[PDB]
């Protein structure tokens, strides 16, 4: 069809389809060639600092959806702050110590820790961590996250290790760090101790046994015919037994059951009667618990003496009232054991095997030793009832294997001494979400003492020496000298040098007469490694500072990084390491379930960027309420990708219709342009404030919907459809067109900046094509600032009413189309019977209201109720087919067609345009 | 002949605009005359029984959103079951006994109880209660909820009271009912005892004091110059002190602080030192709490003995380690008080005023007595610290005024004697959400005995007689006789006649040799009234049975109706009253804040029904995940109205285009149906399966989204989009048109039946206009069943690919019109450059794909795609202007237009249709 060449069609090299999986890597390569992170940090050099301290992810395996969610949220804030008058350094980190690196390394080539020196094994661990760090670094940078990826912090760095030593020493000189014997969580699979924060409770099968302890010395309160009934679910602790615990205040009874005399707490007589399946049980004598103290009983197996002891831990809620007591396993057994001087017998190997202190079961795994023990109890007749019951049991954090209690000398951290200062730090830090304040406050007050000793090789050694008299040596001189050595040669010097070589020259200890010294071989828990980041990173580096403004990790870090960082920082500095905390939820599937490999519901970040691209994944992050748990799936991302497509088309339209627009000259003053064009500018400015405030308040979901509605409803539904009849049909320098292009140019420039934090790849793609831009990247400009328009309030009042009318005419047009009256709006004549208020609104409008409704004919009658034709709130509307022939250029139905023999198929406007602007009269 | 007169436009009496506020009442009047509930119950009288027992709402005021949510949720299940092969009797209830109704007549109306008897006053209470029942009944009926509204149950009914008396008697017979002197919640405003279910915790500002108790005799452990420090926020409990409670296994230290020696717990010394603001405090000695048992302390005011007592309840979490023990104002104080034989002193009366047992403070309100006590304490030199704090405090359920603890003789139900049976009953019940099992399991395990006696007038009497020896009389003979009298005369007979006339004719009790008897005046707890509804309704009504299938109430009923109904039912029957329980959350506003008259964020069902209609509110209930707290505002409902309009438009299209369709003659069998038509039937069968399975799982939001998507993307956007061309233009008996009408008629029947439980008003509105229908209402038919379609897997495999192709085609068409290439899809030629798979798909479709794309021309090219082509996954598409002339009838652009000289403006198809069917026969 002719006259198609006489239209000003959109023209832009910005493609309709982004092809993000193949385009984004080019953008990322171009960003790196720019050194964009250095450019932004140098442009904002003289700006108030905003420091978001990166929590160190563990350097093992590929990044999961939680890693992408965490890093993308951080990237949003750092990018926004870099464009809002702040200097926003970002130093990503990595946690590179602990058991997981050791276990993965061992089976990588079936290498063994016993075939290599500890120093050699650690060096391979360091190599493995660096390989994992590099893999995660390139995956993170594929997400589009900007940062100092070439100068990260890793916990294996000698400078990091040295600073961690100082943090340990400061807590040591303040009395917070102490050593002592205590039953602690132990993982036989890991052959090292654990902590309550490292223990998860899972259900397991256990043997519930009722054992009989026959009395040896009744001490005038019991006879020898009577026996004590203990109940335990851990038969492997029986070889460690040292006594029977009874509650002093509780009343105990002697029971005649099945021809035997049994001692059981009175309140649990019938409960035990059901369990042991007694027949005709009679109560003989009732006694008080304090009477039973120091009564001598006999161990069923070894026939040694068990001392009846008084303890509060005895409860009538579950059991027999008489509690088997072994100080080696169980803390409540230990406290009462030390009260009476009972021996701390712990006959379990570091690998879970019974040692020489358990005759008849030596060299057996404890779970495999339960049956020989229960059999031995039956042989002597001490076994009363055996029933297997499933119950909650402590388990290892990663190996998911059961953990037992062993009485071993470890190192601990006393939160109690400075617990008040922790509380003041909990309230002084802003918490988003708000309930996090209560979560950490209850954690601090209910906290016990933090065990910090691990019997592993890969980690930071405990910088403690021992003299000849076996006394711990922790002075400020020793801590400082160790820290300097770790700074110079790393933590491996602790395992390749003698203890005398790790102390200052000429070091003398009053407990060491011959100058002989020994060194601790334990290492710190990795929660101490990651918790010292505020000292080794925030305060060590020039580009950062302490406290950091923000700490952004998941909700699982209230027990971890949020807690460990506070404990060390308050201990050493007296204040919190963060000015505020932001917490996000976990990533779930579409069904709302946790992702697991067995179910196959895991969404891999690598596959999302291979199939959809990073920008979509970031747009998903902005679309969800991160502060609670979120969902993501193939269908959920497809919905986001459709939204991203709508936004991208909005950008392409702006660029396409600005191809002939010079912002330096062709721009129209806001006063001089039209009201409807000025109305869109006000809406743009309303959008600018909402997005910036939503960025400030960290409400990114609001940004997601605000831009989505602006692109779909405000721009494409009304303004872009309305602008087609001017941008395409009218002359290039038509005053109405230049006013439209001016609003489009303003909309394009501001919207590109607004979405730069989130759609980082697309924003720079749009930015290059924007006319009259003089910066390399949109990241190098500040956010748009709201401008107030003269008479904005009156302008909004008038045109908000017009939009109400426009919605009503749109419904009427849709109904008319459904009744086969018109195929499109241009084929329609709209006659309006309005209210007097509606009429005065239409008289105040100087624009072609028919063109604003995209119709060929608009009539406002003098006033007469029609024959029941589309009654609406503002007016009654009749939709008629327009009269005349259709112009072959703008497809309007007007009688003006054919009034000029030159171009006899065109209307007056289109004939003039070709005559005067393509032929020039 | 006008060409528009030759189009088969839709014709139906179903209005486009619902006008639900003005038309739903007419529907409800039509239901009322039908006796639709009676008809449904009779139609299904042989069907198996499903019982959803209605929880009785209090009849005091208008219904709120929680009520509307509850009933509509109940109405969903009862309606669905009645259509799913069950008999579903729904019997609404009302709780009519209670203090709020008693208070309203006393205060709001001009009723003085001096002028009338108690029985006459209760008659007024019944009259006021009935008015509220009638008011709520109409409001509930306006929601559209079906049920036996004309024969409901109320707690004041003589039969209801007769069975409640039976419940008391059976529990009393089993020994679960007793009268005892124990501390209970007491409301001074109501002058009555209370229960934790009738307690609301509010913030209260009280005075926090620290009081020194001098030591009278240290018994070799303490010294005469040493003192106990106690902490309390209730100074009015000081006159009732009897001793100092300590924890037997906590360590207590004698601390000399600012020239005074005090006894506090070791772990609380620093906390105490901060509150009293001690300057110099030193720990002198240390003893365990067990050693302090014999110590006798001095009461600060009255100088009487204060026995140090040992108690497990004494905690180190707040105040000092020493708690002042008043057995008459606390549960834990009473337990230890009985252990040591302490006097149960309650110097406060039922009106909250200090009695003579508190010399120096007699006649004062407890709040007004705190200041004199603290002043006297300071004058005696025992007040170490006075502070004012704000903390959560128990308040009255009705008056919203703070309560106190008073030791009084009340009636209790001993849960402890059958708590094992309750817990087993909880585990044999299904809970949705599942966590509701944990809530009741923990509540039953951790609860005390239930105080069931109230000192009010409006409620069921406690059916106990007392003899001359003042011993209680509860026998099966007396309980049945009272129950018979209550069934024939009502509960007022207890307040009208005397005790002798309330006993059996010949009654002999050894405790009344003279024959004189007395009757208890206390009434039952309103929770007992509601908690007996299983015996008083399910076992009494012959259309119901016990156990009920389902209890459906809010999350506030785990302590309320669910617990009390379980407690009475398990006591009397040994089983739970319900097979399963469904819990819903509370209704919030758009921001998620609780509704409040202060904020003005309350959504009133009465207004919603007057401005939007019940069906919108019913549609919102299905729209939310009711099993947790939900949100609703005017904007939220307006969003739901948009969804309703789409659904109503879908129904209006089906009715309009089935005007000429008679199923008896014009139906096309599935074998003779087209593939795309059978493909729609396959998708319809999938809708049937998911919707019915979602009703069975109580997952209504699934039905909400499934129906919305089916009407919008599967029907309005896809099937109805190309059905218009056949339906409006082709001949009436055209087989393609009949095939579409067959699918529409099948969908119209299934859709109306599926949505009947939710959009009840609109489903019956559509059902009347459905062609060739015999049943009076949609409620009187069963749900549609899923029928297999041959080749469904192959049908879905193909046409799903076609649907995805069409969406890409639609995206291409939308882009073309935005570039002024076309104005309408009918003005376009589609040129497709398909992939290899797409080429196969388009060859396997026997239908006119160009017709299915609503275009005038389609061309699948074999050449390379041009550079300007729109790239997509399935194909590269070029949208051009269709060649030819537009047909005046069907608006298609074909070269065949202008061939028929009899119809110069018609294409070949339209010209033949007019000539063979509209000009001729
Ligand atoms: C919300 C989270 C995971 C998630 O949402 O994961 C959901 C996706 C899991 C997919 C399943 C994986 C396959 C295994 C299976 O079978 O299940 C937790 C967050 O992770 C990111 C960050 C991890 C950093 O290391 C932590 C630092 C702070 C500490 C000092 O060490 C941190 O912010 C963390 O809190
Ligand atoms: C989910 C609920 C309220 C809600 O969601 O409230 C939302 C609306 C609150 C309106 C507040 C108005 C402003 C007040 C202000 O000023 O603050 C609670 C449920 O209610 C329905 C039913 C009530 C029946 O009587 C209960 C029975 C079972 C018992 C035996 O008596 C029951 O299911 C109940 O559990
Ligand atoms: Cl503004
Ligand atoms: Cl004219
Ligand atoms: Cl209760
Ligand atoms: Cl279920
Ligand atoms: Na600033
Ligand atoms: Na609008
Ligand atoms: Na209790
Ligand atoms: Zn024109
Ligand atoms: Zn035609």
Numbering used by the authors:
A (entry chain B), B (entry chain A): 1 to 921
Sentences from the paper on this structure:
Two IleRSs, mupirocin-sensitive IleRS1 and resistant IleRS2, coexist in bacteria. Specifically, type 1 proteins (IleRS1) are strongly inhibited by mupirocin (Ki in low nanomolar range), while IleRS2, which are homologous to IleRSs from the eukaryote cytosol, exhibit resistance to mupirocin concentrations that are about three orders of magnitude higher. AARSs catalyze the formation of AA-tRNA in two steps within the same active site. The amino acid is first activated by ATP to form an aminoacyl-adenylate (AA-AMP) intermediate, followed by the transfer of the aminoacyl moiety to the tRNA.
To alleviate this problem, we solved the structures of IleRS1 (sensitive) and IleRS2 (resistant) from P. megaterium bound to mupirocin only. The overall structures of mupirocin-bound PmIleRS1 and PmIleRS2 overlap well with those determined in complex with Ile-AMS. We observe the backbone of Pro56 and the side chain of Asn70 forming interactions with O13 and O7 atoms of mupirocin, respectively, in PmIleRS1, which are absent in PmIleRS2. Furthermore, stacking interactions of Phe586 and the unsaturated C2-C3 bond of the monic acid A part contributes to the affinity in IleRS1, while the analogous His582 is reoriented in PmIleRS2. Finally, we found that the carboxylate oxygen of the nonanoic acid part of mupirocin establishes an H-bond with the backbone NH of K597 from the KMSKS loop only in PmIleRS1.
